[PDB]
Design a protein around this ligand. Sequence first.
Ligand SMILES: Nc1ncnc2c1ncn2[C@@H]1O[C@H](COP(=O)(O)OP(=O)(O)O)[C@@H](O)[C@H]1O
Ligand SMILES: Nc1ncnc2c1ncn2[C@@H]1O[C@H](COP(=O)(O)OP(=O)(O)O)[C@@H](O)[C@H]1O
Ligand SMILES: Nc1ncnc2c1ncn2[C@@H]1O[C@H](COP(=O)(O)OP(=O)(O)O)[C@@H](O)[C@H]1O
Ligand SMILES: [Mg+2]
Ligand SMILES: [Mg+2]
Ligand SMILES: [Mg+2]
Ligand SMILES: [Mg+2]
Lengths: 364, 105, 526, 535, 94, 34, 75, 147, 55
Amino acid sequence: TNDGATILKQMQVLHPAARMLVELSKAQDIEAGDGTTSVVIIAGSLLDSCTKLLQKGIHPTIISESFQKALEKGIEILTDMSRPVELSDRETLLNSATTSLNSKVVSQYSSLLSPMSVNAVMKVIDPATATSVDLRDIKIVKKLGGTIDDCELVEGLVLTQKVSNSGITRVEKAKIGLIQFCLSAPKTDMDNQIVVSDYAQMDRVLREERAYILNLVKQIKKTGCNVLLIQKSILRDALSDLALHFLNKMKIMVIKDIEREDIEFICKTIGTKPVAHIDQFTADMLGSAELAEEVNLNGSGKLLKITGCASPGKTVTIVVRGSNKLVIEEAERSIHDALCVIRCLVKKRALIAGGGAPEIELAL
Amino acid sequence: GVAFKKTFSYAGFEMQPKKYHNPKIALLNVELELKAEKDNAEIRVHTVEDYQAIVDAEWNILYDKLEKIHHSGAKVVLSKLPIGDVATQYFADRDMFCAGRVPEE
Amino acid sequence: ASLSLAPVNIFKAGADEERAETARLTSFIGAIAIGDLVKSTLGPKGMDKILLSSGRDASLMVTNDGATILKNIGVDNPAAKVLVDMSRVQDDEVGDGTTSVTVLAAELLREAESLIAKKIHPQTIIAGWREATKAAREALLSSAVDHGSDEVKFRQDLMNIAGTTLSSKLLTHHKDHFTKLAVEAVLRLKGSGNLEAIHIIKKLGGSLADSYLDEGFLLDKKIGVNQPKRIENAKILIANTGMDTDKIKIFGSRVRVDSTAKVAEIEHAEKEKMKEKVERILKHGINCFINRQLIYNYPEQLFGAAGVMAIEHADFAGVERLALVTGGEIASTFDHPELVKLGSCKLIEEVMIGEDKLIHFSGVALGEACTIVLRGATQQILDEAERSLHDALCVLAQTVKDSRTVYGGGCSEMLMAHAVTQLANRTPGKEAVAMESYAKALRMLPTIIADNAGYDSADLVAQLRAAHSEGNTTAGLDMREGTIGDMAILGITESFQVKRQVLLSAAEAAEVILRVDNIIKAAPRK
Amino acid sequence: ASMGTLAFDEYGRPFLIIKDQDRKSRLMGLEALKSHIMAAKAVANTMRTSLGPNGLDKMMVDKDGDVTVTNDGATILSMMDVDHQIAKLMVELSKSQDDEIGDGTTGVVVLAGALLEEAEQLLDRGIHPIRIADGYEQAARVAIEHLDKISDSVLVDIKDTEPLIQTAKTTLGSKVVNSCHRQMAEIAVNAVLTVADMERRDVDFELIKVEGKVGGRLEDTKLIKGVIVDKDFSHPQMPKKVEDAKIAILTCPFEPPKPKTKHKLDVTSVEDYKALQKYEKEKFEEMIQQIKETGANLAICQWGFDDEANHLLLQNNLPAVRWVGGPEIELIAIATGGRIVPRFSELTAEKLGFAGLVQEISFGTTKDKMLVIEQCKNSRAVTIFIRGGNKMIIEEAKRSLHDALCVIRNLIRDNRVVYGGGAAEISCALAVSQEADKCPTLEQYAMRAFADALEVIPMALSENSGMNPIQTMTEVRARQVKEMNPALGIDCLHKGTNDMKQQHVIETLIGKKQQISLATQMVRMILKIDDIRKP
Amino acid sequence: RPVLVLSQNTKRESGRKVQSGNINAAKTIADIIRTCLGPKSMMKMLLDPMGGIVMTNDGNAILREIQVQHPAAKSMIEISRTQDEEVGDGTTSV
Amino acid sequence: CALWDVESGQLLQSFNTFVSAMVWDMRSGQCVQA
Amino acid sequence: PLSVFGDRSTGETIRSQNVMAAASIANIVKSSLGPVGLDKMLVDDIGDVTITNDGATILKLLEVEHPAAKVLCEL
Amino acid sequence: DGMITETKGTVLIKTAEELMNFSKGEENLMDAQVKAIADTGANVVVTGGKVADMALHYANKYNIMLVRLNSKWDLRRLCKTVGATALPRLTPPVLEEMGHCDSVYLSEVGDTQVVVFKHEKEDGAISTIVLRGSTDNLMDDIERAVD
Amino acid sequence: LAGEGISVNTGPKGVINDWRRFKQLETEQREEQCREMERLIKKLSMSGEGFLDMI
Ligand SMILES: Nc1ncnc2c1ncn2[C@@H]1O[C@H](COP(=O)(O)OP(=O)(O)O)[C@@H](O)[C@H]1O
Ligand SMILES: Nc1ncnc2c1ncn2[C@@H]1O[C@H](COP(=O)(O)OP(=O)(O)O)[C@@H](O)[C@H]1O
Ligand SMILES: Nc1ncnc2c1ncn2[C@@H]1O[C@H](COP(=O)(O)OP(=O)(O)O)[C@@H](O)[C@H]1O
Ligand SMILES: [Mg+2]
Ligand SMILES: [Mg+2]
Ligand SMILES: [Mg+2]
Ligand SMILES: [Mg+2]
């Protein structure tokens, strides 16, 4: 890694001053996301000067007060140099992204990742109103294989889960629906048992279980749904084999084991309202999409991509690809740094020159 | 006569009188507290009325034992088996002394 | 013959004991070490400390609080344990004065060591110290000034007390802003002593001056999926119900049927019960719903379809704070909507603080619950700011409870010591010497105050003593320039309760330790 | 003088008699007596410095590092980690004195040590230890008779409590609470007198609750004529103050009833489920209505309750507290005059307790709450609430108050007192010396040694106060002989007078008699032992 | 720290056992060379500790190379040596 | 010790009754009987 | 109290030990008295064998630790 | 004690009346069994197993001496001596199975509490020799001599 | 952590028995160590009490 915050966090520094510097870098990353290396160097240089200042016979309180005065003057100077920026100017955003990506390993790929990062930030916010950017709305997917040139910006939803259906891997004009209940044998929250006292009761149990599953699947199908996402379930089988067979017989793609924490992201992405009981499962709960297919990454895995939605509400997904683990991790970190730079530009509409110019002018 | 140490009085014991001038003593080997009727006993009901009847029946069993002891005329009750807090408070209400877990000797 | 210094051995393996001189030496060494450690962090110019844990966690903590320093140290000397417990109890009773009480106890025990070296029976020292404590307490009470009747004067006193409390801590850089913050937070409590109603949120990043007191309330929980993210003129209903596979309390109940159709029917019955509960909740006519426990997917979907916010897993503190700030009642049954009060606020919306999203309650109805956002550069800075705000809030709440105030900057110590010296000048015997040593320790307190600042402590203390003997009862140390001046004019005031507690606790601990002449140690487990 | 006896036979064959005889030790006769006397002397000399108003404290540290500062001899010896058997015997003697009397746990140790020290010099002169024990027993009987003779009676009436206050003050003078001395003595006297069977019967210490909380000051210690409980109102929105409260003490958790027997309830249809839900809701409403119908204002439970019951209690203007302990439940029932009810159906108006004021107490910036009940009609149970600047003085105040309560209890049992300060023991030594002059010569040495051992406590008191022991004790004894006044003792506080009757230094006769008797019996045992067989 | 009259490594035995042991030692010593008497005697190979080999049927030569611990056997060896030195024959017989 | 909800997977609360003796109560979060 | 670096025996113990040592020395040679007495064999640690009936030789060859036994041997 | 099923015993309660009456019925059955045993004249009862509390109480009510013999060999020897038959159930014994002894009492010998089944006639299937002494080893030697 | 001038004083003279016993045992091991060290290292590079008191 080239990230200063990551470098400081990874190595286990023991001196308390080093730990405080690590916390400083983490705070700078939280507030800004870029300059995590510069701030630590600035603090180190300040303390190095403080050594000579203390050796001369100056109390630390006077040094701190003078440093506060210098900080105020420096903030004034930095504000004076800067110039206003407009979010409608794509060139300035691209230049900021390229400058953020110059120091990272993905510098020859900047021509691809700078517009990608700018578009990703601009697609999740309202340029005329937003005063901050929620970077949790930009999902990053790391898949091995290929090169960093294969990074692609998905306007829809990318799921790492695999389709449980066999032979159904591409749906057009999909009607996606989230399910938060289980398609299996009925099981109340109370302690429940079925008592059999006659021989006919066994085949009655089998027939009624089959009828219940078939009725559930028929209710799901009658709404026009053709792609089903099933939330991950514990203590109850989310997807029974009989239910899977019935869904396959009706030509419905099924994806199970959906993570609980990803429900909100999916709902914001494809405009699907989750359903917890089959009684309320109706057509309005579904989220229309142009295409829902599972793609193969040239033998490096499979991804389920849902591109094209009637309500693409402020959410994008970024797929990062590369040769080995280290390069894809560093590409992810660099892309996050670029997104943080654009976020800072959104928060404070002010741009300043780089290449050490602010530091030289501030020193003078 | 006989004298022995106090044996782990329950709540409400200090409300009982600690002196009698002609008491009748009920020497018992009985567990006087709410508990399962038997270790292997199982209760199977399918109505809330039966549920309430069952809880009232348990309370009535305990209170019937205590009522029999009370109308026995005794003022001091001693037992090998533990005497519960409910029985202790019941005996305190009637101004009697109770002591459970008394040693056999 | 001594217990241990006898031909026969009377102890287990590892058991030890120390007789009069050895016990006194050990106790005095421990007390002096504790006092010297806690001091130099005292006064406006005091410095902070670094606490490194020897455990696997290796937690790093930078603090100026005396109680915090004394808590996180492994002390073997029992007298050190006595001083640590005294400081902890002082912190529990009032937010400030831990360093002051520890230093006063250490100085008193040093004077006691000197007196013992002068061949004075410890009982005489104890009697003299009791007389001196009585005189000093009476003088301090006589010097107390109350401004509770006035409003603007009481507000100014609160300002001065908060500033004096925050002067020593790291917040002295933005003392004015933080003092205003703390006094506003305390005044928002409407006279209640509940300091749990004031919530401190530490968010990394940003400047220390970026810290602020929210005009409403902030919650760090999440909203449901389909529920709205912004509601105006919200009607709040705070609850502590199940909302999560709510099972009937009859634990002996079970479902026993002969078919799966009956099981499905019972499932539908359970879902209908949950739907009926949600309908009963909605019948109150609400826009927002805060539940202490979890809310599963079915009630969450019902609330979303009803267009009602459902904040889940707001812990006991959270629901109590929401009830205090909005006026709602924490209800667990919904069969009587007319008997349940509903909270209100102008607006509820999500806010972007740092990189984390929080729920903002704006235009609250009551507002007797505060949230404070702390922005800092390091975790240690945030923790120290939180501790400093805790000290300031505690002292301000104590002042609100008891409005009597006394002047700080060593003025109270000078006045008490002058009273003690006046008492000692009319008393014959060695009790006079003991009381003079008491007054000497009281003088040593602002001497340490001045030493921490690098000023000439001897000359300043002599000037203060002369001024207090002449009749200038409000003379005190002026740390701005290193001179002495009027504390009433400079606005350096302190809570009378804090000073009285410091004096009494220090005297009590010194008396307790001085009575010891033998330390017997049992064999440790290790 | 060790390792038993090793012979290995006179024929060279192995000679093994006792298992591990080579790893065992043994002491015979006079050497064992000397070792035991030395051990007892060391223990007594350690204890004797903590005797009297000027006695100093001992700082005891246990095996876990917890440190306790105390002046009680029984407490010191209990925590002391001794291995000598005679030291354990001395510890048990002090504990016995504490159990029987509660005061004088330090005097017994010093007296036994002095007795054994004198027995050592008697043994050196060739006297059988049994003779020494017999002489000590005879002198102890003489001293006990003299104590009975010179004893004085005091009034133990509730209307006038001055002698009781003086006795409690004498007990508390040696403790650290001598700053609040009179207030503490008044608290102890009132606490004992409030809860005590008047017909000279027992005083039940279980009805006196001694709980301490850090913070405040020692002077903040007060006697509450009720019960203080460290719990608080269950719902945070109920009022913190209830006046003229009608208490409803219950031991049934506010939950749907549950049979104790292993039971299963079967739900077989939808209507069964609806009936079960309705039954649960109606059970909650019914228990709340039954509680409210009695007219109670405050309800106290023991096993806690759930959310629905809490909200119904809040909604019906019924403050409540949950998870109250069993002893606390009993104390509340005793103090408020209300009965303990096991279930709601048996709750009536006549079973309700009454409390003048039920309040929730805060303790500064600690978030910890505590409920107090007081102003009862005829509260037969009281609680003492101790405040201090640290937990250590809190524990010391607890044990000091226990000593004062025990002394007042002894006064309740027997109203005869003797004047302390060493006056009683000086008079006893004089009586023993006078009796010895008439007995045959052989027991004269034992009786005079007993008198000398009796005279050590006044010497210890004089030495602890800084005065010269021998000169002061001799002067006091000469004054006692010249003018017939067994009340002349050692002026420890330097009040200018030696008459303890004016100084109001009062000791219970039972305490002195128990001290002398227990010391004599332990000394007899220690003298009788002449063999040790430690492994 | 044991107290002793004799040394801790001094062993004493007495009675019928001593006589039986001495007589059994003499009997075994006799049995060693019992078959080496007469015109039809057989050779015996003795491995000398210094690596040599003694191959003979003389009683004294055989007994002289034997190292024994029981003192009665030592007495018998001395008897054989005395018989050999005095007359030069009859060692096995004696 | 802390209490975890098996189904949702969220931390309920960190410390109807459980005892470690030392018994607690998650219905109120207090330490109840010691 | 004595603080003497050694073991001490006093009273009946030391007298009994001395008498036991003397009796052991006696019993060593009591079997070689009178015409019906029988000789003894003394074996060194190097295998040297001594057969004798004389008491003085037997006591000289033996190793003796107790001082009273030494007294008897020298007697 | 009241015998129980060898397969598995589970008391099934479905009404409040059954719960009320179960213990009363069990105690009445125990009392009836003990009284039926006593009505035959059997004033001494010897059992090879444990003794229930209610059974012991009702035996004490009817003045019946209880002796418990854990060893089966001791039970067989007692049956031989008295002349009775070890019944497998708790049914009252018929006159042929009812053993007779001329004196049965509790006595203390030395510092040992013993139960004695003493005949007066110079007959009986089994005769017992009581050995006294001062040492266990000496008494064992005397027992070997008697053997 | 002070009082570096411990001045153990009466201690060594009051527990001199155990100290001298340990000293005697250590010295007894010391003669054996000195005897065995004459062989190892000194020439190797380029019951025990019976051996000791025989030498
Ligand atoms: N192309 C460039 N030419 C000159 N200076 C650059 C260029 N790109 C970046 N810099 C400077 O390098 C500095 C370090 O930036 P970088 O390493 O990307 O992040 P960080 O500030 O966290 O170290 C920035 O202050 C920037 O001014
Ligand atoms: N501005 C000030 N000028 C003079 N003295 C001050 C000032 N602020 C605080 N002090 C003094 O510093 C002492 C210690 O206060 P502080 O260190 O803040 O907390 P603590 O009492 O816990 O040590 C107080 O006794 C007070 O008199
Ligand atoms: N005011 C006093 N003047 C003289 N002697 C006192 C006074 N108060 C207590 N004493 C003596 O001090 C002795 C020790 O009492 P104390 O320490 O309270 O309990 P203990 O007897 O267990 O040591 C008592 O025997 C008593 O006679
Ligand atoms: Mg950068
Ligand atoms: Mg402060
Ligand atoms: Mg006392
Ligand atoms: Mg030949």
